[PDB]
Amino acid sequence: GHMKKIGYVWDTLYSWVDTGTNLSKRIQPITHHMNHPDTKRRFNELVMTSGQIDFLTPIKPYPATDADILRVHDKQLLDNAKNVSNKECGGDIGDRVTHLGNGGIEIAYLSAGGAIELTKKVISGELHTGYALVSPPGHHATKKDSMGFCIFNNTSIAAAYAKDILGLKRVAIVDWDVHHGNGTQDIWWEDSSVLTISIHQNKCFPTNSGFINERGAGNGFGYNLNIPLPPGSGNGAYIYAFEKVIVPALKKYEPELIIVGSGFDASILDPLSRMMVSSEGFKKMASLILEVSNEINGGKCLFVQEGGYSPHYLPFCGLAVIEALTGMHTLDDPLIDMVGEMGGNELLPHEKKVVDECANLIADIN
Amino acid sequence: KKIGYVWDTLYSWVDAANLSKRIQPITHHMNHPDTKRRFNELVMTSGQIDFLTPIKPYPATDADILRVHDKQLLDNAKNGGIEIAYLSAGGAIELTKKVISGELHTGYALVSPPGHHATKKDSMGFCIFNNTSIAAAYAKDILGLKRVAIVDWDVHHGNGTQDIWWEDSSVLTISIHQNKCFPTNSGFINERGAGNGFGYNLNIPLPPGSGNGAYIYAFEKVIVPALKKYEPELIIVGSGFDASILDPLSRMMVSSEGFKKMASLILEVSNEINGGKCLFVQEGGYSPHYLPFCGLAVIEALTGMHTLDDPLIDMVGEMGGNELLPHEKKVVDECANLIADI
Amino acid sequence: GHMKKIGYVWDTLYSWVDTGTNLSKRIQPITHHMNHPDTKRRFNELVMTSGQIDFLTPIKPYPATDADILRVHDKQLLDNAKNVSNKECGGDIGDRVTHLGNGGIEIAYLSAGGAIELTKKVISGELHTGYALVSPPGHHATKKDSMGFCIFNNTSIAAAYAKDILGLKRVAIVDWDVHHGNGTQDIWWEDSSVLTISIHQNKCFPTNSGFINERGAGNGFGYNLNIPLPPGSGNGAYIYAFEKVIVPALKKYEPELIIVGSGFDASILDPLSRMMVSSEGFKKMASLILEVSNEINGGKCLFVQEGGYSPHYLPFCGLAVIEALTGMHTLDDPLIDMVGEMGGNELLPHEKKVVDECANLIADIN
Amino acid sequence: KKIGYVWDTLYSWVDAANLSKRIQPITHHMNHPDTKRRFNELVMTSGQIDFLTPIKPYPATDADILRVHDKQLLDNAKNGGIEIAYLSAGGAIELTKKVISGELHTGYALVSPPGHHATKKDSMGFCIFNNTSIAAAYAKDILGLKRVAIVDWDVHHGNGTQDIWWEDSSVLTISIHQNKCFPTNSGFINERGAGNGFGYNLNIPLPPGSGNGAYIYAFEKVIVPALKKYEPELIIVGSGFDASILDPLSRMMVSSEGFKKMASLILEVSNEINGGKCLFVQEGGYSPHYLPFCGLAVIEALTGMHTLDDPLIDMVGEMGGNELLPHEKKVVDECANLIADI
Ligand SMILES: O=C(CCCCCCNC(=O)c1cnc(N(c2ccccc2)c2ccccc2Cl)nc1)NO
Ligand SMILES: O=C(CCCCCCNC(=O)c1cnc(N(c2ccccc2)c2ccccc2Cl)nc1)NO
Ligand SMILES: O=C(CCCCCCNC(=O)c1cnc(N(c2ccccc2)c2ccccc2Cl)nc1)NO
Ligand SMILES: O=C(CCCCCCNC(=O)c1cnc(N(c2ccccc2)c2ccccc2Cl)nc1)NO
Ligand SMILES: [K+]
Ligand SMILES: [K+]
Ligand SMILES: [K+]
Ligand SMILES: [K+]
Ligand SMILES: [K+]
Ligand SMILES: [K+]
Ligand SMILES: [K+]
Ligand SMILES: [K+]
Ligand SMILES: [Zn+2]
Ligand SMILES: [Zn+2]
Ligand SMILES: [Zn+2]
Ligand SMILES: [Zn+2]
């Protein structure tokens, strides 16, 4: 065709996750929980009211199959999710914060399936790139456990699909959610065929992983790369890490597909991090990935929603990425003049030191 | 025996979107009363209330407000939520009266709306009247005190308090805050007062990402020695909890144990230099999950009764902020050089 | 064409109304206001997740023009709405409960425009019928005043459009929101070219109108018909009123178009009425209108959202109407077995008496 | 002088969607604590608290619960919100103790969770333990009373209370409710007790749409003469406000003035026949806007202090329900024939 085609995966069901649920400890009940669907729903609704949807190609998600999940997760993980989802009131699963409503496994299948649908249509050439605004998120789900709001690891399920079904030999997952993608790291730990990169706040969540000396094992040694930035890092540190480490690592690896785990909890207003990224930072991060993807594999890249918890500001951070994909700047970030003066734009010595240490790991990528 | 606690149901009755900019309306606004209400409710369900002396607030008068604010500010406020603003400032006065008189040793005034951004001329940043400056002016003008210290550990800069006492050495104003957080263009170390007040305003603008390590170091290296140097007859703490590791309106990493130690250091120096005449007045804070435990930790520092554990203690202890970083210590040491002019 | 075409008008902006805002009276502030967008948004989202959207033809609304509004409202009403919408914080307008956010007049134009778009496509034959899930509502807006959450009178603006632009000579507006359509009654009070029918709880809102002896004036005498049912009426009274009064009145009048003002606040769970209609009642009401429309004007009818305040049950009441239009029963009402035993299904003597008095007014319709 | 008021912060700390049925999750559930919390807060900001005697609740014991409930119910409840259920029943006991002893004349226990649907065997309808039946059993077994009356004007049928005292004439159980509202299959006039209890359960199932007219007529024609006939030594009122004109869980039209008159009629007959020994225990109610004014109206009936107007008085006065309709009066007159067997 002769149309610029940027895919957008959304489904009302992604906003229907049951995020509902100690007195002895005098922990008073919360009604509006941290992972409430409002935050990501406001992002979807801004895509629509900003007019960006007029430049996007809506892509209907279809459920991932059990076989799609079993490519990267244990049968026990899947059996546990089916069991909890079948309970009359649903329940928690994996850890103390991850919850399934009754029947909620359907949304988890559809979230993974949305990442697969975007992957299929990008690899086929039907779409140049796109954004999958899926819920629930994925990157903390390991081979063995759901956790951290993540039932199934959507980006890893997409990468395995691209490998097994679409013939790809090298995939890179670049995770810029502010928390460590420990699930993705675990799944591909011993596998050089998926380069796994996580940039995150050092020791944020999980508090015990994401360190720079977690580099893979066996055939996978050197094919996991963690960038654990200090609290308070903003656009300066993030853009420097993308230009000094992530882009050069991708060029060295030559992935046939780049899957971005796109969270916005590194934003300056997110409660679940101390990072200071603005919408302008996220726009640049997205643009750097699109550019290096065009350079090394003909633009085969796509973005899949992970975390983010600011209902005020996440919609504008997500829109900035969308506008980087469409080339259409239709709406201004209304916080930019206040957030820009708050700090984070300048690269600090301690931030630069971490990134430069991470840069030394690129030599072991082949 | 006598720790005062100022609360009133009306403090929880406090009552910007733009469609052309596609800013979708928010139902639950940032300063919603739930967060401070959950603090009060934890004071009761924890049993801490059994060690506190409840203190009824009474409305501050127009003359109370006009000791520090211009008529134009008060007329703007009048031209019916002003009732709660009066009662908030009135609660700070009530606690101040009862500490100075000797009825109470110390106490906490969980008031709303907050105060430290209100300057002589303008209300701003959720603040109608400057509660702590109104209580200090009352202590000076009605109760006869010559020197008051206001120590503001809300994570934002106390620009209102700085402005009110800018040219006045009879109120030492100290603000520790995240550099450039709010307001974005104030709170720098070179803002030191003017005239007779030169040297009697002290800003500690810590970098984003600072935690217990930087905060405790700042208190032991700067704030406590500044207080010893100044010899205040009363210490009023502007106690916000928005430096907490979960607060959306800052990037700092203070834990409930950090706020406890911060309160302890103030009580300890007060006990040593002015008979323990100190009190704590609520400023900001926006984490419904975590602010109640930060506030309780300060209460427990006043009552000496540890009745409840912070459920996050193991979590945040592994997240960092507890080590003093070199960039943090350099800012603090710079500020410490300013004490020689007090 | 050879496709069954049932239109569905929705726009994200309809869920963006600012429903935000006394201490002396010790009236404690409410955070989640009565007219919060959640209720009607849950109806839109159930249209999507129930699969009903697959049988619907999405119709994009376009803004009504000032001229469309000025066909039925005073210039002062429109000037007031523009003034309030322009204020930095918006403000109340008309009465003490009707609120505009900053820029909120755009949603009011788009709500009226959605009713116009459905009217155009039904009259043209592009659609057989359809449902416009617009917000804000319309039926309390008079010639002179916005009120009762209603900025502009959407169904009257649509009827006037159909008359002035599309050539129609007779239109009927049938209003089954549980409150009296006093705005619609006022606009067409002296006009026999729009038959205005309101069925509502007697004395609910406005408390001082909706009575059976309000029948129009002048050329309009006998061309306004109020059915003020007693509190506690349910399916029995409503279906009887539709079969004994509303359907015969429409047959006598022979409208070229039937516009339904479709509220669901007569439902058994709505806080703003004491009525007991179930989803099955609303399904029958819709079906009776579709049937009489097919009999007398070739199916030229359409439904436009008015009120409703139960987030639990309004989605299932609205879906029941949607399913009556599509012919596709894809989802069960999960309350039907409990609501059905609660009363309201039986026609009571006092309910029948009111309806029969209303039936005597049909003789004056020509 | 002595009107008791039972409240505890924990009563406001009380902590169904199905995706295959496309029932979208609800965040703010029907029994959210805001509604009853707003009632408590209006008691304070209205100044009514200044005329009340605060009464601290204490936990009801297992033996308190087992006077009316089976072990299987209590074991199901145990197998940590049960703490609040204990404290709710305990608050009803505390008020009962203090009324019977003479320390207080009357009072209101604003407890949560509610109680009247809990039968001997099963918790249900938001009710864990039957608070009013636990207080009546305490009054009988511990305090020696021979006759108790429980008058339940929550809009739903008190099936739990009916079940507990079904075969017992020593507790006269009266429920006025919307016919077939909840549970949908109980509350009919032919449910009159069994055995020694035959004639000592009295249901008044009013039709949907009933308002002040039917409710006041029912109280003057049935409930008050039933109480005079029975001569209770204590009157316990199960006070719900879900018959209010704005409640989503009923179709009745009672206003705040209707609840005031209802409370007044009970206090008046109590003052005449058992020394005023009556008390009021919170049951249901779901209108955050209007329930606080309905509850305050009952408080004002106990204290005799009208400090605040109902902001809806003019609105609802024009909405009807105030006239007694023929279908309503026929139900009431039918129920009145049942008094001859008390
Ligand atoms: O974006 C992501 C997200 C990864 C997962 C991050 C985990 C987020 N934690 C929560 O939501 C959370 C965890 N505990 C709690 N309470 C809690 C904490 C400790 C013990 C018991 C409860 C809590 C609950 C109610 C009130 C107050 C509190 Cl303290 N409340 C919320 N990954 O990429
Ligand atoms: O603790 C303290 C606090 C002092 C005060 C700090 C300022 C707090 N700002 C807000 O609450 C605030 C400011 N704008 C906004 N929106 C906003 C931003 C830019 C333009 C227009 C509106 C906003 C509103 C609705 C939805 C989304 C957004 Cl973005 N929303 C919230 N001092 O000690
Ligand atoms: O569907 C429709 C809807 C027609 C319009 C129906 C009007 C609906 N009234 C409200 O929303 C409303 C009206 N007053 C009030 N408070 C109120 C009542 C009287 C005086 C002052 C305020 C109120 C506010 C907060 C807390 C408690 C209360 Cl009492 N609170 C809500 N038409 O078809
Ligand atoms: O005051 C009293 C009260 C006594 C108890 C009366 C019963 C109260 N029912 C509920 O709260 C209730 C019951 N089901 C439901 N959903 C429901 C209905 C049918 C099937 C499954 C769920 C529901 C849940 C979420 C969203 C939408 C819906 Cl429809 N949602 C709420 N007694 O004195
Ligand atoms: K790997
Ligand atoms: K990451
Ligand atoms: K000074
Ligand atoms: K400060
Ligand atoms: K007419
Ligand atoms: K109507
Ligand atoms: K009995
Ligand atoms: K009852
Ligand atoms: Zn994250
Ligand atoms: Zn602050
Ligand atoms: Zn209505
Ligand atoms: Zn009830």
PDB file of N, CA, C and O in Angstrom, chain B residues 21-57:
ATOM      1  N   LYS B  21      -7.207  21.799  26.029  1.00  0.00           N
ATOM      2  CA  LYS B  21      -5.893  21.194  26.178  1.00  0.00           C
ATOM      3  C   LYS B  21      -5.962  19.677  26.337  1.00  0.00           C
ATOM      4  O   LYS B  21      -4.913  19.029  26.461  1.00  0.00           O
ATOM      5  N   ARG B  22      -7.172  19.114  26.308  1.00  0.00           N
ATOM      6  CA  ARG B  22      -7.421  17.684  26.458  1.00  0.00           C
ATOM      7  C   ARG B  22      -6.835  17.166  27.765  1.00  0.00           C
ATOM      8  O   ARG B  22      -6.273  16.065  27.829  1.00  0.00           O
ATOM      9  N   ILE B  23      -7.000  17.967  28.816  1.00  0.00           N
ATOM     10  CA  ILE B  23      -6.695  17.563  30.181  1.00  0.00           C
ATOM     11  C   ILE B  23      -7.993  17.004  30.761  1.00  0.00           C
ATOM     12  O   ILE B  23      -8.912  17.754  31.103  1.00  0.00           O
ATOM     13  N   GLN B  24      -8.077  15.677  30.843  1.00  0.00           N
ATOM     14  CA  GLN B  24      -9.306  15.012  31.277  1.00  0.00           C
ATOM     15  C   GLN B  24      -9.580  15.280  32.759  1.00  0.00           C
ATOM     16  O   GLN B  24      -8.668  15.205  33.592  1.00  0.00           O
ATOM     17  N   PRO B  25     -10.820  15.595  33.123  1.00  0.00           N
ATOM     18  CA  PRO B  25     -11.127  15.842  34.534  1.00  0.00           C
ATOM     19  C   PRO B  25     -10.728  14.674  35.428  1.00  0.00           C
ATOM     20  O   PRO B  25     -10.864  13.501  35.060  1.00  0.00           O
ATOM     21  N   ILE B  26     -10.232  15.036  36.613  1.00  0.00           N
ATOM     22  CA  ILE B  26      -9.853  14.131  37.690  1.00  0.00           C
ATOM     23  C   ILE B  26     -10.917  14.245  38.776  1.00  0.00           C
ATOM     24  O   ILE B  26     -11.290  15.359  39.162  1.00  0.00           O
ATOM     25  N   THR B  27     -11.393  13.108  39.286  1.00  0.00           N
ATOM     26  CA  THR B  27     -12.396  13.169  40.350  1.00  0.00           C
ATOM     27  C   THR B  27     -11.756  13.312  41.725  1.00  0.00           C
ATOM     28  O   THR B  27     -12.211  14.121  42.543  1.00  0.00           O
ATOM     29  N   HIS B  28     -10.688  12.562  41.977  1.00  0.00           N
ATOM     30  CA  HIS B  28     -10.029  12.490  43.282  1.00  0.00           C
ATOM     31  C   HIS B  28      -8.777  13.358  43.213  1.00  0.00           C
ATOM     32  O   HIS B  28      -7.735  12.929  42.713  1.00  0.00           O
ATOM     33  N   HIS B  29      -8.880  14.584  43.715  1.00  0.00           N
ATOM     34  CA  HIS B  29      -7.847  15.582  43.497  1.00  0.00           C
ATOM     35  C   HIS B  29      -6.668  15.330  44.433  1.00  0.00           C
ATOM     36  O   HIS B  29      -6.760  14.576  45.409  1.00  0.00           O
ATOM     37  N   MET B  30      -5.540  15.971  44.118  1.00  0.00           N
ATOM     38  CA  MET B  30      -4.290  15.610  44.780  1.00  0.00           C
ATOM     39  C   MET B  30      -4.356  15.851  46.285  1.00  0.00           C
ATOM     40  O   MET B  30      -3.887  15.020  47.074  1.00  0.00           O
ATOM     41  N   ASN B  31      -4.952  16.971  46.703  1.00  0.00           N
ATOM     42  CA  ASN B  31      -5.109  17.304  48.115  1.00  0.00           C
ATOM     43  C   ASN B  31      -6.415  16.800  48.707  1.00  0.00           C
ATOM     44  O   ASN B  31      -6.979  17.450  49.596  1.00  0.00           O
ATOM     45  N   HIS B  32      -6.900  15.656  48.247  1.00  0.00           N
ATOM     46  CA  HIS B  32      -8.111  15.086  48.813  1.00  0.00           C
ATOM     47  C   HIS B  32      -7.927  14.829  50.308  1.00  0.00           C
ATOM     48  O   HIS B  32      -6.835  14.441  50.742  1.00  0.00           O
ATOM     49  N   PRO B  33      -8.971  15.034  51.119  1.00  0.00           N
ATOM     50  CA  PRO B  33      -8.825  14.856  52.573  1.00  0.00           C
ATOM     51  C   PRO B  33      -8.535  13.431  53.020  1.00  0.00           C
ATOM     52  O   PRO B  33      -8.205  13.259  54.200  1.00  0.00           O
ATOM     53  N   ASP B  34      -8.673  12.410  52.156  1.00  0.00           N
ATOM     54  CA  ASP B  34      -8.465  11.045  52.630  1.00  0.00           C
ATOM     55  C   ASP B  34      -7.094  10.876  53.272  1.00  0.00           C
ATOM     56  O   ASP B  34      -6.976  10.231  54.312  1.00  0.00           O
ATOM     57  N   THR B  35      -6.045  11.442  52.668  1.00  0.00           N
ATOM     58  CA  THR B  35      -4.687  11.139  53.131  1.00  0.00           C
ATOM     59  C   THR B  35      -4.472  11.574  54.582  1.00  0.00           C
ATOM     60  O   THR B  35      -3.994  10.787  55.412  1.00  0.00           O
ATOM     61  N   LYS B  36      -4.834  12.820  54.913  1.00  0.00           N
ATOM     62  CA  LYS B  36      -4.663  13.288  56.286  1.00  0.00           C
ATOM     63  C   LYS B  36      -5.713  12.678  57.209  1.00  0.00           C
ATOM     64  O   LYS B  36      -5.451  12.484  58.404  1.00  0.00           O
ATOM     65  N   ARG B  37      -6.905  12.393  56.681  1.00  0.00           N
ATOM     66  CA  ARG B  37      -7.907  11.677  57.467  1.00  0.00           C
ATOM     67  C   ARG B  37      -7.402  10.298  57.894  1.00  0.00           C
ATOM     68  O   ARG B  37      -7.596   9.889  59.043  1.00  0.00           O
ATOM     69  N   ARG B  38      -6.741   9.568  56.987  1.00  0.00           N
ATOM     70  CA  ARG B  38      -6.210   8.255  57.345  1.00  0.00           C
ATOM     71  C   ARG B  38      -5.144   8.355  58.431  1.00  0.00           C
ATOM     72  O   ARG B  38      -4.993   7.438  59.246  1.00  0.00           O
ATOM     73  N   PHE B  39      -4.419   9.473  58.477  1.00  0.00           N
ATOM     74  CA  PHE B  39      -3.470   9.699  59.562  1.00  0.00           C
ATOM     75  C   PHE B  39      -4.212   9.821  60.888  1.00  0.00           C
ATOM     76  O   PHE B  39      -3.915   9.092  61.845  1.00  0.00           O
ATOM     77  N   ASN B  40      -5.231  10.687  60.943  1.00  0.00           N
ATOM     78  CA  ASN B  40      -6.017  10.809  62.170  1.00  0.00           C
ATOM     79  C   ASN B  40      -6.592   9.463  62.595  1.00  0.00           C
ATOM     80  O   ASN B  40      -6.484   9.070  63.766  1.00  0.00           O
ATOM     81  N   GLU B  41      -7.144   8.709  61.646  1.00  0.00           N
ATOM     82  CA  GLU B  41      -7.787   7.456  62.004  1.00  0.00           C
ATOM     83  C   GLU B  41      -6.782   6.433  62.510  1.00  0.00           C
ATOM     84  O   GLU B  41      -7.109   5.645  63.402  1.00  0.00           O
ATOM     85  N   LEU B  42      -5.548   6.467  62.003  1.00  0.00           N
ATOM     86  CA  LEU B  42      -4.535   5.567  62.530  1.00  0.00           C
ATOM     87  C   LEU B  42      -4.133   5.962  63.946  1.00  0.00           C
ATOM     88  O   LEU B  42      -3.871   5.088  64.778  1.00  0.00           O
ATOM     89  N   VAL B  43      -4.077   7.269  64.237  1.00  0.00           N
ATOM     90  CA  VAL B  43      -3.871   7.713  65.614  1.00  0.00           C
ATOM     91  C   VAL B  43      -4.895   7.062  66.540  1.00  0.00           C
ATOM     92  O   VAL B  43      -4.563   6.635  67.654  1.00  0.00           O
ATOM     93  N   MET B  44      -6.141   6.917  66.080  1.00  0.00           N
ATOM     94  CA  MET B  44      -7.138   6.325  66.974  1.00  0.00           C
ATOM     95  C   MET B  44      -7.058   4.805  67.031  1.00  0.00           C
ATOM     96  O   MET B  44      -7.089   4.231  68.124  1.00  0.00           O
ATOM     97  N   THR B  45      -6.955   4.128  65.892  1.00  0.00           N
ATOM     98  CA  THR B  45      -7.033   2.669  65.924  1.00  0.00           C
ATOM     99  C   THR B  45      -5.749   2.026  66.436  1.00  0.00           C
ATOM    100  O   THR B  45      -5.773   0.862  66.842  1.00  0.00           O
ATOM    101  N   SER B  46      -4.639   2.750  66.404  1.00  0.00           N
ATOM    102  CA  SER B  46      -3.377   2.264  66.940  1.00  0.00           C
ATOM    103  C   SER B  46      -3.332   2.320  68.458  1.00  0.00           C
ATOM    104  O   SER B  46      -2.423   1.737  69.059  1.00  0.00           O
ATOM    105  N   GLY B  47      -4.281   3.002  69.082  1.00  0.00           N
ATOM    106  CA  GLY B  47      -4.240   3.238  70.508  1.00  0.00           C
ATOM    107  C   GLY B  47      -3.374   4.398  70.928  1.00  0.00           C
ATOM    108  O   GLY B  47      -3.333   4.714  72.125  1.00  0.00           O
ATOM    109  N   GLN B  48      -2.690   5.055  69.986  1.00  0.00           N
ATOM    110  CA  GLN B  48      -1.853   6.202  70.331  1.00  0.00           C
ATOM    111  C   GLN B  48      -2.675   7.309  70.979  1.00  0.00           C
ATOM    112  O   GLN B  48      -2.156   8.064  71.811  1.00  0.00           O
ATOM    113  N   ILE B  49      -3.955   7.423  70.600  1.00  0.00           N
ATOM    114  CA  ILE B  49      -4.837   8.439  71.168  1.00  0.00           C
ATOM    115  C   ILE B  49      -4.924   8.316  72.686  1.00  0.00           C
ATOM    116  O   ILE B  49      -5.152   9.313  73.383  1.00  0.00           O
ATOM    117  N   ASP B  50      -4.744   7.108  73.221  1.00  0.00           N
ATOM    118  CA  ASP B  50      -4.804   6.908  74.667  1.00  0.00           C
ATOM    119  C   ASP B  50      -3.635   7.563  75.406  1.00  0.00           C
ATOM    120  O   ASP B  50      -3.703   7.727  76.629  1.00  0.00           O
ATOM    121  N   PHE B  51      -2.569   7.940  74.700  1.00  0.00           N
ATOM    122  CA  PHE B  51      -1.423   8.622  75.291  1.00  0.00           C
ATOM    123  C   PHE B  51      -1.390  10.106  74.959  1.00  0.00           C
ATOM    124  O   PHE B  51      -0.454  10.803  75.366  1.00  0.00           O
ATOM    125  N   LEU B  52      -2.383  10.599  74.229  1.00  0.00           N
ATOM    126  CA  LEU B  52      -2.449  11.986  73.814  1.00  0.00           C
ATOM    127  C   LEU B  52      -3.518  12.726  74.600  1.00  0.00           C
ATOM    128  O   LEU B  52      -4.476  12.128  75.086  1.00  0.00           O
ATOM    129  N   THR B  53      -3.339  14.040  74.712  1.00  0.00           N
ATOM    130  CA  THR B  53      -4.340  14.915  75.299  1.00  0.00           C
ATOM    131  C   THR B  53      -5.064  15.634  74.172  1.00  0.00           C
ATOM    132  O   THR B  53      -4.464  16.501  73.523  1.00  0.00           O
ATOM    133  N   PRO B  54      -6.314  15.299  73.875  1.00  0.00           N
ATOM    134  CA  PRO B  54      -7.019  16.007  72.803  1.00  0.00           C
ATOM    135  C   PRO B  54      -7.168  17.482  73.139  1.00  0.00           C
ATOM    136  O   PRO B  54      -7.478  17.857  74.278  1.00  0.00           O
ATOM    137  N   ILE B  55      -6.892  18.317  72.139  1.00  0.00           N
ATOM    138  CA  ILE B  55      -6.949  19.771  72.245  1.00  0.00           C
ATOM    139  C   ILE B  55      -7.949  20.268  71.212  1.00  0.00           C
ATOM    140  O   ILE B  55      -7.769  20.034  70.010  1.00  0.00           O
ATOM    141  N   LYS B  56      -8.994  20.963  71.677  1.00  0.00           N
ATOM    142  CA  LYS B  56     -10.001  21.522  70.765  1.00  0.00           C
ATOM    143  C   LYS B  56      -9.473  22.791  70.108  1.00  0.00           C
ATOM    144  O   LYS B  56      -9.062  23.717  70.812  1.00  0.00           O
ATOM    145  N   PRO B  57      -9.480  22.879  68.780  1.00  0.00           N
ATOM    146  CA  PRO B  57      -9.094  24.130  68.128  1.00  0.00           C
ATOM    147  C   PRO B  57     -10.228  25.131  68.200  1.00  0.00           C
ATOM    148  O   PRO B  57     -11.407  24.775  68.262  1.00  0.00           O
TER     149      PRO B  57
END
